[PDB]
Amino acid sequence: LGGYMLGSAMNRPLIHFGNDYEDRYYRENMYRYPNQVYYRPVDQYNNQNTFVHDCVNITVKQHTVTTTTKGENFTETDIKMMERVVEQMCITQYQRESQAY
């Protein structure tokens, strides 16, 4: 929606998911996940957890609509992994937004 902003792109972290299948799955499917986040201006949140929570939901929602339009779909695992990595990226974005303000 409105008032959201799109952050600059970031390095996809290497992420370990705790078992052979998810590690392998992630390595193979990670190109399908966002490499940047949507967020509301940092002044508009009560703390880091709220900002991050919002950044994650909005970003994933938006990515899901644009991936769906291209005729592709996210599985439940996709959503879980995407959630974890977008949460990491949102934390980085908050940190970066924060040392200005």
mmCIF file of C-alpha atoms in Angstrom:
data_model
loop_
_atom_site.group_PDB
_atom_site.id
_atom_site.type_symbol
_atom_site.label_atom_id
_atom_site.label_comp_id
_atom_site.label_asym_id
_atom_site.label_seq_id
_atom_site.Cartn_x
_atom_site.Cartn_y
_atom_site.Cartn_z
ATOM 1 C CA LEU A 1 0.000 0.000 0.000
ATOM 2 C CA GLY A 2 0.882 3.667 0.544
ATOM 3 C CA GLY A 3 3.554 5.104 2.767
ATOM 4 C CA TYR A 4 5.701 2.055 2.207
ATOM 5 C CA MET A 5 9.192 2.323 0.923
ATOM 6 C CA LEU A 6 11.487 -0.190 -0.758
ATOM 7 C CA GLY A 7 14.934 -0.561 0.800
ATOM 8 C CA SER A 8 18.128 -1.010 -1.177
ATOM 9 C CA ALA A 9 19.119 -4.581 -2.159
ATOM 10 C CA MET A 10 21.270 -6.617 0.168
ATOM 11 C CA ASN A 11 23.514 -9.643 0.122
ATOM 12 C CA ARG A 12 21.626 -12.847 0.530
ATOM 13 C CA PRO A 13 23.043 -14.431 3.624
ATOM 14 C CA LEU A 14 24.077 -17.990 3.727
ATOM 15 C CA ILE A 15 21.365 -19.475 6.061
ATOM 16 C CA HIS A 16 21.418 -22.952 7.709
ATOM 17 C CA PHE A 17 18.044 -24.496 8.493
ATOM 18 C CA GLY A 18 19.119 -27.374 10.711
ATOM 19 C CA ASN A 19 18.622 -30.404 8.418
ATOM 20 C CA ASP A 20 20.009 -31.734 5.070
ATOM 21 C CA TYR A 21 16.802 -31.189 3.102
ATOM 22 C CA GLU A 22 16.047 -27.663 4.078
ATOM 23 C CA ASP A 23 19.693 -26.633 3.689
ATOM 24 C CA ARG A 24 19.718 -28.078 0.219
ATOM 25 C CA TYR A 25 16.212 -26.708 -0.606
ATOM 26 C CA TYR A 26 17.178 -23.253 0.534
ATOM 27 C CA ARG A 27 20.412 -23.261 -1.505
ATOM 28 C CA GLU A 28 18.338 -24.203 -4.571
ATOM 29 C CA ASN A 29 15.251 -22.018 -4.098
ATOM 30 C CA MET A 30 16.664 -18.878 -2.517
ATOM 31 C CA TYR A 31 16.823 -16.976 -5.846
ATOM 32 C CA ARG A 32 13.002 -16.999 -5.651
ATOM 33 C CA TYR A 33 12.930 -14.944 -2.452
ATOM 34 C CA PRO A 34 13.127 -11.174 -1.961
ATOM 35 C CA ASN A 35 16.507 -9.496 -1.767
ATOM 36 C CA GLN A 36 15.012 -6.239 -0.504
ATOM 37 C CA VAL A 37 12.307 -5.197 1.916
ATOM 38 C CA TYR A 38 9.322 -2.877 2.030
ATOM 39 C CA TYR A 39 8.785 -0.865 5.168
ATOM 40 C CA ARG A 40 7.164 2.149 6.810
ATOM 41 C CA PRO A 41 9.378 5.018 7.991
ATOM 42 C CA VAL A 42 11.142 4.060 11.225
ATOM 43 C CA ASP A 43 9.650 6.966 13.345
ATOM 44 C CA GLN A 44 6.233 5.329 12.951
ATOM 45 C CA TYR A 45 6.943 2.259 15.051
ATOM 46 C CA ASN A 46 7.132 1.680 18.775
ATOM 47 C CA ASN A 47 10.292 -0.446 18.674
ATOM 48 C CA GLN A 48 12.317 -2.884 16.585
ATOM 49 C CA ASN A 49 10.047 -5.956 16.932
ATOM 50 C CA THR A 50 7.002 -4.129 15.604
ATOM 51 C CA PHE A 51 8.851 -2.601 12.661
ATOM 52 C CA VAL A 52 10.395 -5.910 11.762
ATOM 53 C CA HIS A 53 7.071 -7.819 12.125
ATOM 54 C CA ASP A 54 5.441 -5.331 9.784
ATOM 55 C CA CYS A 55 8.273 -5.268 7.293
ATOM 56 C CA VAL A 56 8.135 -9.038 7.119
ATOM 57 C CA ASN A 57 4.397 -9.363 6.514
ATOM 58 C CA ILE A 58 4.171 -6.588 3.972
ATOM 59 C CA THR A 59 7.265 -7.727 2.046
ATOM 60 C CA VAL A 60 6.188 -11.320 1.890
ATOM 61 C CA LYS A 61 2.639 -10.361 0.859
ATOM 62 C CA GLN A 62 3.919 -8.204 -1.928
ATOM 63 C CA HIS A 63 6.450 -10.717 -3.113
ATOM 64 C CA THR A 64 3.748 -13.363 -3.149
ATOM 65 C CA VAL A 65 1.496 -11.288 -5.340
ATOM 66 C CA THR A 66 4.316 -10.488 -7.840
ATOM 67 C CA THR A 67 5.547 -14.069 -7.961
ATOM 68 C CA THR A 68 1.967 -15.325 -8.401
ATOM 69 C CA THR A 69 1.382 -12.923 -11.343
ATOM 70 C CA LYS A 70 4.417 -14.527 -13.043
ATOM 71 C CA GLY A 71 2.451 -17.750 -12.630
ATOM 72 C CA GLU A 72 4.768 -19.236 -9.954
ATOM 73 C CA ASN A 73 3.885 -20.278 -6.389
ATOM 74 C CA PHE A 74 5.309 -20.506 -2.933
ATOM 75 C CA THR A 75 4.962 -23.620 -0.934
ATOM 76 C CA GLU A 76 4.643 -23.644 2.846
ATOM 77 C CA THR A 77 8.387 -24.213 3.152
ATOM 78 C CA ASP A 78 8.978 -21.309 0.794
ATOM 79 C CA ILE A 79 6.949 -19.094 3.077
ATOM 80 C CA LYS A 80 8.782 -20.282 6.200
ATOM 81 C CA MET A 81 12.237 -19.725 4.707
ATOM 82 C CA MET A 82 11.222 -16.479 3.150
ATOM 83 C CA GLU A 83 9.890 -15.378 6.530
ATOM 84 C CA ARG A 84 13.166 -16.167 8.249
ATOM 85 C CA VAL A 85 15.369 -14.443 5.682
ATOM 86 C CA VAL A 86 13.126 -11.438 5.234
ATOM 87 C CA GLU A 87 13.138 -11.114 9.060
ATOM 88 C CA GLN A 88 16.955 -10.962 8.937
ATOM 89 C CA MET A 89 16.867 -8.390 6.159
ATOM 90 C CA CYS A 90 14.284 -6.304 8.016
ATOM 91 C CA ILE A 91 16.490 -6.268 11.089
ATOM 92 C CA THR A 92 19.374 -5.018 8.946
ATOM 93 C CA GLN A 93 17.132 -2.357 7.408
ATOM 94 C CA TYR A 94 15.971 -1.172 10.802
ATOM 95 C CA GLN A 95 19.588 -0.979 12.018
ATOM 96 C CA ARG A 96 20.520 1.031 8.951
ATOM 97 C CA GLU A 97 17.450 3.359 9.260
ATOM 98 C CA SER A 98 18.121 3.751 12.913
ATOM 99 C CA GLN A 99 21.623 5.277 12.886
ATOM 100 C CA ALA A 100 20.546 8.451 11.171
ATOM 101 C CA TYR A 101 17.688 9.035 13.557
#
